[PDB]
Amino acid sequence: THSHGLFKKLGIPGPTPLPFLGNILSYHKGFCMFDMECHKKYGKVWGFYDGQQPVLAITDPDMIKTVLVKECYSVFTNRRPFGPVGFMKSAISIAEDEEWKRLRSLLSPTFTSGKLKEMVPIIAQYGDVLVRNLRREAETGKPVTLKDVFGAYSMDVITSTSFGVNIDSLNNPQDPFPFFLSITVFPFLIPILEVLNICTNFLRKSVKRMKESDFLQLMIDKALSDLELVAQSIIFIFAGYETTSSVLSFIMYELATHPDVQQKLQEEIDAVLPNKAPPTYDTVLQMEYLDMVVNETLRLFPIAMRLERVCKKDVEINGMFIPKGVVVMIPSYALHRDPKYWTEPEKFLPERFSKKNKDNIDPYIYTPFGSGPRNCIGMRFALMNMKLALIRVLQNFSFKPCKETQIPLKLSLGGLLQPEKPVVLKVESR
Amino acid sequence: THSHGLFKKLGIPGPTPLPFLGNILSYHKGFCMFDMECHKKYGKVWGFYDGQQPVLAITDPDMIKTVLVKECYSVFTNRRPFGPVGFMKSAISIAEDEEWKRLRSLLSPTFTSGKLKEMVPIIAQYGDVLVRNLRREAETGKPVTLKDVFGAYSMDVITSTSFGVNIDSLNNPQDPFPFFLSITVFPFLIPILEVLNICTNFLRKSVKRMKESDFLQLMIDKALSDLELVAQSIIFIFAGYETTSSVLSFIMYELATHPDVQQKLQEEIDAVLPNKAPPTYDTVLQMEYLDMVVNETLRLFPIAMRLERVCKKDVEINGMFIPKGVVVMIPSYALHRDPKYWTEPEKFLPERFSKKNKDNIDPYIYTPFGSGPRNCIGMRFALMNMKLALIRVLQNFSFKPCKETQIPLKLSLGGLLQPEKPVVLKVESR
Numbered sequence: 001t002h003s004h005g006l007f008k009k010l011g012i013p014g015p016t017p018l019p020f021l022g023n024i025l026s027y028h029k030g031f032c033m034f035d036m037e038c039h040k041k042y043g044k045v046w047g048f049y050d051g052q053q054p055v056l057a058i059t060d061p062d063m064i065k066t067v068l069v070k071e072c073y074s075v076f077t078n079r080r081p082f083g084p085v086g087f088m089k090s091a092i093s094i095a096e097d098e099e100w101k102r103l104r105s106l107l108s109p110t111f112t113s114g115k116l117k118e119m120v121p122i123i124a125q126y127g128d129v130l131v132r133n134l135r136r137e138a139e140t141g142k143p144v145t146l147k148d149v150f151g152a153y154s155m156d157v158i159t160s161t162s163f164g165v166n167i168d169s170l171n172n173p174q175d176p177f178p179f180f181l182s183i184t185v186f187p188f189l190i191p192i193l194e195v196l197n198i199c200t201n202f203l204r205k206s207v208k209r210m211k212e213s214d215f216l217q218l219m220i221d222k223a224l225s226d227l228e229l230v231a232q233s234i235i236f237i238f239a240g241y242e243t244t245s246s247v248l249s250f251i252m253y254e255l256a257t258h259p260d261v262q263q264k265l266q267e268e269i270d271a272v273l274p275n276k277a278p279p280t281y282d283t284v285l286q287m288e289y290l291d292m293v294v295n296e297t298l299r300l301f302p303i304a305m306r307l308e309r310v311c312k313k314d315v316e317i318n319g320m321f322i323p324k325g326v327v328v329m330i331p332s333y334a335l336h337r338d339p340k341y342w343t344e345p346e347k348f349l350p351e352r353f354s355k356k357n358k359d360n361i362d363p364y365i366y367t368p369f370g371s372g373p374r375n376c377i378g379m380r381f382a383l384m385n386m387k388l389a390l391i392r393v394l395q396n397f398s399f400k401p402c403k404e405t406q407i408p409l410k411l412s413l414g415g416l417l418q419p420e421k422p423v424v425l426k427v428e429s430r
Numbered sequence: 431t432h433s434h435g436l437f438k439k440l441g442i443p444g445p446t447p448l449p450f451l452g453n454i455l456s457y458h459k460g461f462c463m464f465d466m467e468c469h470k471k472y473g474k475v476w477g478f479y480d481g482q483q484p485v486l487a488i489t490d491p492d493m494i495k496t497v498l499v500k501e502c503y504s505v506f507t508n509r510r511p512f513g514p515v516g517f518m519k520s521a522i523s524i525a526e527d528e529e530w531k532r533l534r535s536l537l538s539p540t541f542t543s544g545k546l547k548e549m550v551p552i553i554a555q556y557g558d559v560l561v562r563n564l565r566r567e568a569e570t571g572k573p574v575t576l577k578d579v580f581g582a583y584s585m586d587v588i589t590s591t592s593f594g595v596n597i598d599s600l601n602n603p604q605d606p607f608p609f610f611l612s613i614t615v616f617p618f619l620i621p622i623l624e625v626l627n628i629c630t631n632f633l634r635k636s637v638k639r640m641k642e643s644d645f646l647q648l649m650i651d652k653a654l655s656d657l658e659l660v661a662q663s664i665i666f667i668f669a670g671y672e673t674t675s676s677v678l679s680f681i682m683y684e685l686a687t688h689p690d691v692q693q694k695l696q697e698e699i700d701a702v703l704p705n706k707a708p709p710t711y712d713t714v715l716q717m718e719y720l721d722m723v724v725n726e727t728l729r730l731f732p733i734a735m736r737l738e739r740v741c742k743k744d745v746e747i748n749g750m751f752i753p754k755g756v757v758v759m760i761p762s763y764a765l766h767r768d769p770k771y772w773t774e775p776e777k778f779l780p781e782r783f784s785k786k787n788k789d790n791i792d793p794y795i796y797t798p799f800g801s802g803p804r805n806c807i808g809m810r811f812a813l814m815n816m817k818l819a820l821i822r823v824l825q826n827f828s829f830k831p832c833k834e835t836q837i838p839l840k841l842s843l844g845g846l847l848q849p850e851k852p853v854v855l856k857v858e859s860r
């Protein structure tokens with residue numbers, strides 16, 4: 001508990017840290033409730049300890065703009081060190097400084113407006129596998145676990161949008177994937193596990209055997225290793241499955257508990273796409289209410305909850321001294337629910353993002369995809385992927401609450417932003 | 431042994447590393463013999479592994495100038511990480527990047543030509559305690575352990591040149607101070623010990639109680655903490671004792687085994703200082719042969735043996751790619767004995783440093799005090815301290831080999847550059 005006097009010195013409020021543990025016992029209600037409580041207890045700026053690690057929480061939109069944008073390349077370049085990783089240290093999400101800058105430029109032309117438009121005719125296939133897999137569980141009046149049929153779709157998308165492998169995700173899906181804590185109170189142990197190779201060889205040799213003799217194309221086309229190829233593929237595999245399915249489950253819960261929004265969305269889909277027209281790249285972007293629903297759900301459920309940057313050297317941002325080594329954190333979940341910015345923040349209201357009202361929204365308060373040079377590189381792909389899925393599903397089915405549907409939806413009091421009970425809804429055919 | 435293929439990839443020769451251990455088993459003859467052997471086996475550039483840590487050895491004087499001078503602030507700023515340290519991480523010798531740059535500027539005016547000239551009237555006291563402590567062990571024909579009477583002098587110097595405490599170092603000296611290895615093959619364990627406070631509180635509270643209510647003066651006069659004061663004091667205490675005594679023992683051994691040089695030096699001392707005149711700041715600098723003896727001894731015995739810098743990012747120096755994280759090492763001991771630069775290098779010959787021959791010496795081959803911005807900050811003080819001691823001792827005593835004198839002198843086959851057996855010589859009074 002030696003370094004537990006930093007914020008007392010700097011005159012920054014926060015919860016009193018216990019020795020060794022710091023303030024980690026306060027995570028018993030989850031990161032979200034802890035951040036929402038501290039945002040009320042200490043105001044605009046406070047600090048806590050993840051073990052011996054000082055973490056300063058900031059809410060000033062100017063100070064957030066400074067960290068994420070103005071001083072990204074200079075001071076706030078990297079996220080919190082995460083280990084043990086092994087060869088995955090070369091992943092773009094985990095790499096640091098110059099190595100990250102080289103990876104960012106190398107992987108950036110994957111999600112251009114042109115490369116995304118090339119994927120719309122490809123994504124349109126598994127949307128029909130998604131509907132037909134749902135039409136079976138709908139003609140039988142059997143409630144549907146959404147994350148299963150969504151994850152089956154989300155897995156089909158990422159394997160082909162990046163590589164080209166086509167699999168109906170109801171036969172054998174070759175893609176499998178607590179203790180993830182303790183690292184906080186035992187980071188000294190991270191370099192320890194850095195050597196006993198505790199990092200499966202499943203795609204470590206299978207994806208490594210991407211002989212191919214797309215994102216896989218533009219890579220072999222400084223330079224990039226074939227393993228540097230494996231680690232990035234795993235990263236792009238991580239997001240496009242779990243994030244895509246979890247948000248789509250979050251959307252259908254809110255569309256089920258708010259039937260008025262679900263119908264108003266179905267009316268717009270039939271308008272832009274008459275006769276159940278196939279969704280194209282440009283017709284998806286025309287739908288504004290679909291964008292408002294996705295934006296409002298991501299406000300209530302920012303699947304990242306927090307944004308983090310490591311302060312690599314002493315700085316004085318927006319009139320506040322911040323010492324080297326301190327982790328700067330932006331409580332995305334708490335800011336998305338801050339009543340000082342959102343009227344009735346717990347209520348699902350897509351009209352916050354109407355073009356009449358989308359101007360009263362600060363882009364450093366609503367940050368579902370981060371901000372600055374190190375934002376979510378797969379943002380445009382993710383939004384398009386989820387929107388292409390919502391259109392084809394709502395064009396065919398309507399969703400109603402079931403007997404076993406968790407109303408209201410508890411968030412996972414544990415680590416990652418998921419529901420406690422899975423989202424099960426009744427599916428009816430139009 | 432995963433990272434044991436770096437030099438095989440780069441096409442750089444070196445000894446084959448065993449798993450986990452790397453090449454540390456080759457240290458069984460000491461760093462010096464290992465460096466001298468590898469300098470012959472692989473030529474101008476080679477690499478080895480300190481456990482899993484790659485260390486690239488360079489001998490090209492241009493590449494040495496690049497690392498130590500041209501690219502010091504940019505790439506080669508810090509030495510190898512050393513731990514566990516505790517609060518001593520703020521020491522100038524251990525600090526890194528900006529924190530070191532702030533410490534360097536803050537402590538640099540301590541060893542100016544003016545501040546050194548203020549210490550000559552102060553150092554002249556304990557030189558007489560050194561002579562009188564020797565005159566007792568000389569009027570009794572009892573051989574003298576040099577490092578005892580030298581360390582007693584060297585301890586008297588550092589306590590007053592920096593603080594002002596006066597003690598005859600034959601009563602109780604309040605200054606006490608293997609496993610130091612393993613860190614190489616167990617650095618993962620360094621952050622581990624970083625928390626169980628394995629770093630005595632002896633001067634940690636005594637020197638901390640430097641109420642004083644000099645180097646201590648110029649400190650309280652960005653800013654500097656009072657603990658930042660303790661750590662630096664300990665650093666300055668480390669060098670001025672052990673380094674000063676060990677080199678003075680190295681000099682008297684060579685002056686004893688080479689009586690012709692010892693007399694030619696005594697003749698110059700009586701010339702510049704007739705009637706055993708007290709040595710002053712300017713009379714010490716006039717003595718060239720005294721400088722040549724000190725320089726030649728430091729060639730045969732560079733007490734640091736090696737210079738090291740951590741390559742903080744990918745670079746291509748003098749036409750050689752060097753990857754991030756690699757430790758760049760300059761084998762000072764091996765270069766000081768390189769026959770490609772020195773004629774009969776094992777032979778003590780102060781005439782190498784005569785002004786007729788001091789021009790045939792490359793300053794990036796002879797580096798007893800390092801080079802560049804991070805050179806030995808206490809160089810000018812150390813040379814003056816040792817020279818002020820040699821003058822007053824040789825003005826009174828002559829030294830001859832004894833029965834138990836180790837001839838030839840074995841170097842310590844262990845870690846730090848010391849003799850195996852201590853240097854014991856017979857002392858006679860002129």
Ligand code: HEM
Pocket residue numbers: 068092093094104235236239240243244247302303304307308367368369370371373374375376377378379381382383
């Ligand atoms: C609803 C979907 C998604 C959300 C809400 C989301 C959110 C985020 C957030 C908050 C960050 C951190 C930004 C920061 O710290 O400033 C991030 C980073 C990242 N995202 Fe996503 N993400 C989503 C989907 C995806 C997808 C489909 C990909 C496909 C490759 C992806 C790839 C990445 C990568 C590689 C990073 C690391 C960026 C870097 O380190 O340069 N994400 N994402």
Ligand code: HEM
Pocket residue numbers: 498522523524534665666669670673674677732733734737738797798799800801803804805806807808809811812813
């Ligand atoms: C015969 C006497 C001495 C020798 C041969 C010697 C040698 C060296 C060497 C080789 C280095 C490393 C240079 C490099 O890596 O480039 C160094 C650094 C250093 N020396 Fe000495 N030294 C001696 C005495 C002293 C004394 C009396 C002091 C008094 C304060 C001192 C203070 C330091 C410090 C603080 C550093 C670290 C420099 C930095 O990190 O900026 N040394 N010395």
Ligand SMILES: O=C(N[C@H](CS[C@@H](Cc1ccccc1)C(=O)NCCCc1cccnc1)Cc1cccc2ccccc12)c1cccnc1
Pocket residue numbers: 079082085088091093094235238239242243303304376416
């Ligand atoms: O990713 C989850 N935990 C991460 C751990 S780091 C790493 C994952 C990893 C790589 C190699 C070995 C072991 C693990 C990573 O590359 N992760 C972002 C990639 C997908 C992605 C995910 C989300 C948004 N966008 C892209 C921390 C984290 C959480 C949340 C948001 C983050 C945002 C940025 C960086 C780290 C973030 C995770 C979460 C839930 C289920 N499964 C895994």
Ligand SMILES: O=C(N[C@H](CS[C@@H](Cc1ccccc1)C(=O)NCCCc1cccnc1)Cc1cccc2ccccc12)c1cccnc1
Pocket residue numbers: 509512515518521523524665668669672673733734806846
């Ligand atoms: O210092 C010796 N071991 C060092 C270890 S790091 C540190 C010492 C320390 C600080 C705080 C906690 C524990 C240890 C240090 O501050 N050390 C240079 C200071 C004196 C000094 C010494 C020599 C020259 N000039 C100044 C590595 C090293 C060796 C040799 C030369 C180096 C040169 C530069 C940096 C590290 C060097 C050591 C050696 C022999 C006996 N006793 C201790």
